[model samples]
Target: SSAHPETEPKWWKEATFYQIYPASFKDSNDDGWGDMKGIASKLEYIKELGADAIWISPFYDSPQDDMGYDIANYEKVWPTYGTNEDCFALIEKTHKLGMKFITDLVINHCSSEHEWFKESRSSKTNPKRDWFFWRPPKGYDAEGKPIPPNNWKSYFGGSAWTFDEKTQEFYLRLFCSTQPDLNWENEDCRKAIYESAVGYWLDHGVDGFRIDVGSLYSKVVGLPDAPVVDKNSTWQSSDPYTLNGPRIHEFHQEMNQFIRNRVKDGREIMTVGEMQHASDETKRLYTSASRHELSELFNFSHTDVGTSPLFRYNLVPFELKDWKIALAELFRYINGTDCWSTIYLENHDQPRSITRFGDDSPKNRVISGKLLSVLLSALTGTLYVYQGQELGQINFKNWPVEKYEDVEIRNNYNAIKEEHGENSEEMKKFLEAIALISRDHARTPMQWSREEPNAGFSGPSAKPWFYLNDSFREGINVEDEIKDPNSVLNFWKEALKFRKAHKDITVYGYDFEFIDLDNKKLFSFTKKYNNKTLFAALNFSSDATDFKIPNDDSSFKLEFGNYPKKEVDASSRTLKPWEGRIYISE
Candidate 1:
């Protein structure tokens, strides 16, 4: 029996979330980037889209490297984002509007510009010297010069360790050189981090945290050299020891205690960790009732599987079979547990899923988005819809390489050629891939109105930091979608309405039966409760698909669908391209 049964419900279990990348959400001050005040101003729009909670990207003070995923100070808001007053106002407004707000918590590392790191690197005898991973050069090279402390590569580029002439040692940085990894092995590091970093917002009324790279907390005990990767080795090929390390669960359990401290004060706070390839079983354990390590997790396994051999760094066409296997394993595993988790297809890091996973061409974008919505909403977990997703946003395309701002895209532009070879076809392919798959595509300003300049993200005179996907004017903006009943935005509104109206079947019910697995294009499933059962059938491809309900019955009645009239009576029906519907059967 599941520990959490259908009767008593948690707020997060029924939450419909919307994530906003602060730099692009809106700009009230016209500073060319979005901020807390800007986000607060848009609460009505958030509510209109049926998002009960908002997951905002980092607004903490820091050098804007890596899309605000690095932290310099936890107590203060970035000057561009707003003041502490503005932060408080955003929280108050969200609470006033009856919605939850979660901020990005990047505790795995801190900006090298942070005071702690600065003080730690000041001297070998500094009190905070052990706060970060620091090591002496591993036997100098032939030229009597320093070698990196280890062979591991930074996720952005080069060795994970950087030599510091002043400290006469190398310091570990798993991401960019500007972002140094914190040493969780030291108790002082962990304690101060949780107290000052996490406690600041917890004290200020922020609902909870969306932990960035939560699984990389613990490192190998000795910082031993990692095995060499002789194959398509990019930093995506991080050292095995750096992930889900020995004390990771212990650390999470402690962090969970820290989170509970906030929840103890009568707030139903939620914690979701952004895990990179954390095992499905381990993730389940994180959210397990008895364990309670985290409220939920954002796992990239499903999104990571269907792409190119290079994974997210390229543009190979996606496969439905890969997605099916991934989804099946996830649904089956999650079904056996009482734990809950996030359901999202797009976030700040990954490219837009509508185009990445589905047909985003003009002919298919609306239907494809609706199908994606239908399929995503059918899952029995919290739903997260990124900005512009409801309007069927497509990827920003045909940009000159110079328009790209993401460090990853810019770095890989030249580095891939060097890795694969100069003037080779591999280099050419990488250039083309970066053109379409860069993370900057996800950072483009929100498309509010096609008639307004800069796609209505900022004042007409203010230029956004990232390029505005002008394709919004081609009919993907909110203003146009709101007026069109058949638009993807309205479809999402209906889909979310459906989920809320049937929480008994969607949120509390856990019995999931895959009704049609062998079918190549149709994804069909059923959810069962004590006396209520809901069935959902969706087409993932651009072509029409025929699916027969597993049981031949006349009792199943169509309740909601993008093309409700097209459904055949109970026994069987052919699904139009990217069409889907829900039903309840006796």
Candidate 2:
């Protein structure tokens, strides 16, 4: 049934993965934080949602500077999250329930508090000194202050280089100063990283990993200054010097050897890289089977529809054509190469899909959620559903800076405020931009119930680590949605079922083609497999639109739809606001 002869059946490739943001998922201990035990208890719920695997966000030991992305200890779970035993128990329960488990692999950098960093910084002569990148100042200032090694800017904000007064040298940190980048150039560092970050988890029975910042392992030979993109900015963006660097592929192949060793035991280990600045060709190279790099990578092109390349937080109006074209290009990549792809609209790092890609108003929210599910079902790739995505969660509405807890949010806001003044118009604009594009929107606690206190994410009196999305108090919650047949959660359940039922035609069959390319508000496409064809049409706008099937044939049967009983027809049909329908001809 597979279309590509080079592609053989694999568990990860055919699976639909449900991503869990640990702290926001569920708080079983009522300690106001979600732990491994809480995640374990919800395995049945995820399984019932028709997911084959769960890609959990980091619960590793951290200072919570970047919310566990800055790992203080690779092998230890944070005390707040749970114990090592709890981690193993979660993995065990997932397997027992017939689901696979993959945890976040954040080895690109470690917390400054990490023992390696602690030793590396203690003295220049320490054995661990080479584990991290350290260099002397480029030049001294008029006041004899040491300057940064280069003009590279951190992704979060400020200079990428942080001066360590103890060592009298600066260490490279691509994110927050607390999270120092590891020197992959050192074989000793890579070896220790594999043992602590990869081997330990594999020994405990994790199916695989979702590698964080996969393309950032290696640095350009010399720490070169980036081109000044913004004249008003002090430090330039670091992407050109850091992303998809010279030896990135070499590092991935070496890491794959460690993973390949475990796979010899008949276990299927999946590794999906989060390639931030990778180009189309770069992604193809990483996922190609013979390359032995990664299984797949998350494509950011579609999600980065409205954001400016200079600064992702800078917003603009997103057009549907760009969204459509970006996705279409991924299908082309699969057809043109021996690489598979991933289909996802929401994850722990981004805002809710219903609001970003569909209508989130009262009249169209539910149907829009169902609309996205149709897109998920008809796409060819490994599917991913964010925590509250199945429930049609919306973004935070005009949240104040005080309400946001993410370090990135705080860092960017502070930097902008300092540069543009505390009460400058740019500061207010930055706040407005975050309302539509803040990572904190996705960080909101998962709503489990509409009636339970704090939406049943924790005990009645227990305060959540992060506030729940207030809209959950009204309608979108598992407790209420599970009971309604027409709820977004229930619709997602059926949509996933449909994808699995027709796995041949949906997951592994044919290259898709976009139809109605000229239609601005209606996105339509077709998927074919042998003698079968699946046609899907989606209304992306709030207003109803007329869309006509390319070929006016009566052969197609209405297989699924968001609205009630819409009979399959080839004539121009008025698709209701945020409506989605799938028809099949066999």
Candidate 3:
């Protein structure tokens, strides 16, 4: 029944996790912000939906400069989200509902307003001066003005180093200037951070963590310049220097000791790192069982395989053969080693799956969403569903610049317009790009119902902090989908049950192989181990595709499908628009 030898239980390997961007999930108060109490109110919603665990986004005390990612105090909850009681209550309630809880962890940086940063900036010789990456100017510009320490650029925009006039030095900040990167090189800083931050959360009964930007913890010793890929765009600056540096592997291994300590008291803590652009060689090292660095990795390279590099507006058409080959490669890479994949289609940072990968037209949304779900569940590792994904939620593509809230979107827009003049063709393309690729597309509040105002997220008197997807409200919402036999939500409910019933074949069974790779409109594959086999035949287009069972010895029983069946013959079949099925060996 299991891929690996049966021994100690590994709960995370096959779990179905539900990720919630707490700020836009629901509002407990009419104060126009989502809080812990709001999340607690929805615990029943998740438990009833058949999720094994909840992976919530950051909710720490922050200045909100870049949302809650900028932590001002790691130990305290922001007043807006209520006291620490609310935090602990959410955890308590999640367990009471028989589910596990894992909160977001971002050790990459802290808010500049943090006490340590304040003291570090107060004077050059402060005790916490070495806590963050700081360096003196390399040399002056032509006009004798101070310049950045290196040619590196922030992921958002502008130079990675920010000049602090007070100290006459530049501090390295890979993100917003307000969010400074922690100097993991300093042993004392790492110890204090782990003790005061991560230790505090684990002691409070958080089952695990979903690390944000986990791979950028270490930098080159000399703070060397990253290669500038695009002359006009600083965002194209190199990442090799900061990705998986020499000390990173050692640092995470040391931190793993703290995680291993909490496992004795029925608290099985796990960690999943967000390894951005990490090579397969690096992933092999990061999640190796003996290394004790992390349990799994949020490998995003697979998702970005066919997407645009710049605005992400025009997707490089997702060819089935190319997709099949890439998916198989990634699965083989991790399966060959001691690792797992955090597979997903939606999250706080990306657009809805229906629009990004599947057909978003009114006719195809529901079925395609379910098709994506089947493919996701059929994979050999953990599966994830972000908020509103079960409802087949579509992106809020009708947003303008004034409606955007993400700093990354706003900054990139300005930079693009600046590089290519405002009235140029590039600017027009950017306008189209934001509507397609902006993070705000996913940030829209969850649509609970039209029966209540603002989709039942907040009170009538208050407005939501972000834009809500209104056009799709007529067809998609929890109230209506919960009862519909053929709705996306109910489809997900059935999919989860099916996965659980056949966990042996779907989760624990042996390796998979891609089929129909040459078929233009179909992406098909088979999963097998010993006598049990599960095959998935998927249709990726709106039109039908001709198909047939490859061999007479390989018989299949239809276990699940979204569209009505039309078997043309014992030798052939036709899959209607976006149709897919999981078949079991009979």
Q: Using lDDT as the measure, which candidate wins? A: 2
**Deviation from truth (RMSD, Å), model 1:** 2.3
Point out where model 2 deviates above 4 Å: 1-3, 566-572
- Taking the candidates one at a time, how many backbone clashes does each contain? 0, 0, 0
Q: Relative to the unseen true structure, what is the C-alpha lDDT of residue 351 in candidate 3, on a scale of 0 to 100? A: 78
lDDT tens readout by residue for model 2, 508-583: 7565788877678999988777778888888898888887666647888777777765444434488877778888
User: For candidate 1, lDDT tens digit of each residue in 1-586?
Assistant: 2443422478887899899999999898777898888788889999999999998888889898877877888778898989989888888999899999888889899998899999999999998999998899988989998988666766665567788999899998887777889999989999889987788778888888888999999887777777665356544445477888888899999988877775547877788888766677777777776686877788776767644644356556555666766665444556656677667888878777788767888888888888888877777777789988888888887887778888777656555666777687766776777655667778899888885678778888897888888778788988888999889999999889988888777766577777766677878888876667778888887788887766647677887777655544444587778888788775
List the lowest-lDDT window of 10 residues for candidate 3.
1-10
Q: TM-score for all predictions?
A: 0.94, 0.97, 0.94
Better of 1 and 2 by lDDT: 2
Residue 566 in model 2: shift from native, Å?
Answer: 6.2
Native-to-model Cα distance after best TM-score fit, residue 546 in candidate 1, in Å: 0.6
Model 1 TM-score, 2 decimals: 0.94
Deviation from native of the Cα of residue 154 in model 1, angstroms:
2.0
RMSD (Cα, Å) of model 2: 1.7
lDDT comparison, 2 vs 3, better candidate: 2
**Worst window of 10 by summed lDDT in candidate 1:** 1-10
